[PDB]
Each structure stands twice: as C-alpha cells, then as structure tokens.
C-alpha cells in the first residue's frame, strides 16, 4: 500500500475534435503534426482551439479585427482566429486586413476583399507562417453569452446581479417579494 | 441547546484583569493606525460600544478603513472548508498594534541596509537568510576544578 490520492489522476482533455467534420479533423491532424515537430506554442494554441468546442469560440467582429490591425506595427501582420468573423454594421471604414480563419461571413468577406484585404484558410496559414511568424492571435468574447448572464451567485443572495430564469418580463413576474423594500425585504 | 446571545460565554473573556480596572490610559487613543496595518483584537469590557464579536477576540487582522474613533479590519474566520475575510468595524479601545509585522519590517530594513553597505564598500553580498539552528559543533570540555561527580539512584525512603 502507498498513501496517495487518485481523485485527480486523470485530466479531462480533447485529444481530437468531437466534430465529425472531415476537414476539421484534417486540420487538427495537420496542426498536431506542426505542433509536435516545430515545437511552437503558437501551433499548440492553434491545435487546442481547433479541437475546442464551439462554445469556446465566440464570433469575432470585423470592428475588432480592424482595431487590431490599425495598432502601430500590426498593419502588415496576419490576424489568426479560430472564431467566425462577422460583419459589423456600426463599422464605417474597414482597413486592409489579412486574416486566416475557419469561417468568414458573407458581408465581412465582401468588405474585407473590397478594402483590399486577403482571406486565407488555416492550411494556407500553415504554408505561409509554419511557426506563426508575424501573426496576431484573436478570438471573440467568451463570456458574452445569454447563458453566462445566468451564471454566478444566485439571484436571491446579497449583492448579486445574476439574471433569473423567468417565463416572461413584466410587473407580474418575480418583482414583488425580495426585490423591493415595500414587500418584506430587498437583497 | 445554548442561547445565541452576543456575549454568551464571555464571562472571563470580556472581564478586566485583576487590579487593572478603571480609567483607560490615553496611549490607546494616541496610537497611530493606518490602512494596511496589522492589529490584534482584544476586547475591552469597559467599552460596550464598537465591541468585536467573541469569535474575533485574540485574532489578528488588517485595517482597511480609518474613521474618527474606529477602524475597519479584515479578519480571517473559519467556516467549514473556507476561510472568509470578514470585515468588522472595531473601536480603538479594543485594538492593539501587532508586533510580528513590525519585526518583519525591521528585518527587511536591516537586510536592505546591509546589502547596500556591502555593495557600496565592494564586499561580497552577505547571507540574508534565516537558517534553522544547526547541530552543535565540536568542542572540548576541561575537568580542572570540575571533576566529574559519580551519580547513582537513591534508595526508597518512607516519607510519612
């Protein structure tokens, strides 16, 4: 007998994408090879984000892409993101962007190409910068989800701003007792 | 079950020391407290206002607020498997500066001064680590005027 604890012996991890998409699996294969051989944490990050679940890859905004590219020194670097690149109607001027991504929406692609930009795939990025040179790694906001709005301390505890699960919205839906001092108390 | 009043079981905890009752000496109020300082909590029964709870008596905390005649303190409290940093507003009379932190500050001051002096004078960097007391070294003991005494166990004697 040996006095050790086995509760945390096994670590849950994704050794390959849960997706059955053949192209996603091929990309995971390619970047597993690249990470293993080049030994670059950039390739490791790309592999991990390829194998991640779609929940962890929130959509990215063309406004964020433009902001990243406009910063001093980033004008010529290639922006790499495993998140879908969406179009931002609030963005009026779009600079020249060189982006490698899994998926780019129609409007964002049209605007990027019209502005003189370039869109490539992850394998093309592998051919361009096998070690990730001259890259700007970006992703969408992970905590910006309606589901995440409901996470945290329970709505009925002090100093809690968690969103409750309510059938509807109105004066008749969980707004009387425990929400205002005129009814018992307020938290 | 026990009653859950505020001062249950504090008969001796909140009492004054023998031949120590009466007027409170004024160095207690003259002492300077600043936010970030460490202070020990020892309730003074003679001041019923701003008293700490019995669970914080004899505990050390860190000041985060300084009011006219009181201070806000962050004290660690054990609750099941978590240690909560509770915030309590205690008056000055129940508070005493903690000496452990000031001793550590003095040690750090001395370390910095020694390092600076050695560097300026060109000496090698001296050792600035506390070390556990090492085993005793080799030495010699002389018996001159200290001849060994032969000891033996003593017989049992009926001590009525």
């Amino acid at each position: 007998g040996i006095d050790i604890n086995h509760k945390h012996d096994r670590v849950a991890r994704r050794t390959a994408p849960k997706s059955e998409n053949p192209y996603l699996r091929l990309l995971s294969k390619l970047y597993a090879f690249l990470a293993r051989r080049t030994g670059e944490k950039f390739n490791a990050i790309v592999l991990k984000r390829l194998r991640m679940s779609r929940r962890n890859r929130q959509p990215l905004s063309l406004a964020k892409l433009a902001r990243a590219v406009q910063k001093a020194g980033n004008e010529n670097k290639t922006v790499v993101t495993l998140s879908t690149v969406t179009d931002d109607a609030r963005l009026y001027t779009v600079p020249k962007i060189s982006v490698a991504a899994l998926h780019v929406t129609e409007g964002a692609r049209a605007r990027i190409l019209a502005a003189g930009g370039e869109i490539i795939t992850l394998d093309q990025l592998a051919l361009k910068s096998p070690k990730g040179e001259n890259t700007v790694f970006l992703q969408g906001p992970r905590s910006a989800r309606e589901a995440e709005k409901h996470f945290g301390p329970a709505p009925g505890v002090p100093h809690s701003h968690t969103k409750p699960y309510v059938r509807s919205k109105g004066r008749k839906f969980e707004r009387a007792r425990g929400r205002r001092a005129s009814r018992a108390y307020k938290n | 079950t026990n009653s859950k009043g505020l001062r249950r079981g504090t008969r001796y905890m909140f009492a004054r020391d023998f031949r120590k009752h009466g007027v409170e000496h004024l160095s207690t109020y003259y002492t300077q407290y600043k936010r970030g300082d460490l202070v020990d909590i020892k309730t003074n029964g003679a001041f019923q206002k701003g008293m700490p709870f019995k669970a914080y008596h004899g505990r050390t905390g860190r000041i985060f607020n300084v009011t006219r005649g009181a201070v806000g303190i962050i004290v660690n409290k054990r609750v099941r498997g978590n240690i909560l940093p509770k915030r309590i507003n205690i008056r000055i009379e129940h508070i005493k500066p903690s000496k452990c932190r000031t001793d550590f500050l003095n040690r750090v001051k001395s370390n910095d001064e020694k390092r600076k002096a050695a560097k300026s004078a060109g000496q090698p960097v001296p050792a600035l680590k506390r070390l556990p007391v090492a085993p005793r070294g080799a030495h010699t003991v002389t018996t001159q005027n200290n001849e060994p005494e032969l000891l033996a166990p003593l017989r049992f004697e009926i001590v009525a």
Partner: protein, 179 residues
C-alpha cells in the same frame, strides 16, 4: 517499556553535563555506570537518572562521552553484591542480593533474571542503586556462602540426557545414574 534484552547486559560509563548558559557559564560534569543492551539505551537511561537527580533534561544537556567497560580479569570468580530499588504491584522496596560470577555485567544480568523469576518484576520497575564486590566473609546469603568451601564436592544425581541427531525411537536402555 524498558527491557533488559540480550544475554549478559553490557556495562557503559556515561559522562554528560548541562549545556552552559549565560547565568551558569560552567556546569558540573556528571558520570554514571549503566548496564544496558547497547549504547543508545545507555544514553537513554543516563538521561533518565540524571533528570531524576538534577534539574536537567536531555534537551538542555549533552553527552560528553559514552564508553564501554570490559571486565578486567574474566579469569577469576568473585562475589557481587547488588543494592537495588524496585516497585511491586503494591509498594516500593529496597533489596540487597548476592551473586557469584566472573563479571559484574554477568552478575547484573543474573540479578535481572532472578528478579524476573522470583518477584515477576520487569526491568522498567527496577533501579540498580549499587554493585560491588563483596569478600567471602562479608557475604550474608546462604546460597552464595555454601560455595565458599575449598572441599566442596557433589555428584550429579539424576541426569536426563537428550539425544540430538538421531531417531526418536531406540532399543537402548536409558540410564540416569552415572557412578
């Protein structure tokens, strides 16, 4: 608890002293004679007795020297007197016992075995106050005195002999008498 393990307990001389302090820069040196199985037990019992006798414990003291004492002449027989203090199930008593042996360590081992046999007393309940060599005419125990006779003679009356490396069964007759 303490046990007198090992045939023929060894004898050690142990010298120690309290660790000097500022108020007592020079400390007295104490010395004891201890019979124990090995020197670790010797030191332990030394500190036991020294803590009993003087205000000092192992933490505040040190062992200047631990040495083994060997019998000067194991080629001669002596009578040994042993003054000991021991505790029974009811009270505490002082005993004086006598033994005959070629070594003081052997005599002390005999004392431990004899106390175990006759009073069911274990080594942890016995303190050996003193061990000395007594002259023939200063002995006061009949068992030892009856052997101080130059004309001593006696046979071996009923000798039961154990066969060692043979079969259990035999046709030989067994003889217990040998004239």
């Amino acid at each position: 608890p303490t046990k007198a393990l090992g045939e023929t307990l060894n004898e050690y001389v142990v010298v120690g002293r309290k660790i000097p302090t500022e108020k007592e820069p020079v400390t007295p040196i104490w010395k004891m004679q201890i019979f124990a199985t090995n020197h670790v037990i010797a030191k332990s019992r030394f500190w036991y007795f020294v803590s009993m006798l003087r205000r000092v414990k192992k933490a505040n003291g040190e062992i200047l020297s631990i040495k083994q004492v060997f019998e000067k002449n194991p080629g001669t027989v002596k009578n040994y007197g042993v003054w000991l203090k021991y505790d029974s199930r009811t009270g505490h008593h002082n005993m004086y016992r006598e033994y005959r042996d070629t070594t003081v360590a052997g005599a002390v081992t005999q004392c431990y075995r004899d106390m175990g046999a006759r009073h069911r007393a274990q080594a942890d309940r016995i303190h050996i106050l003193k061990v000395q060599t007594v002259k023939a005419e200063d002995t006061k125990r009949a068992g030892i005195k009856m052997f101080h006779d130059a004309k001593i003679r006696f046979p071996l009356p009923h000798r039961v002999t154990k066969r060692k490396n043979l079969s259990v069964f035999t046709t030989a007759r067994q003889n217990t008498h040998f004239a």
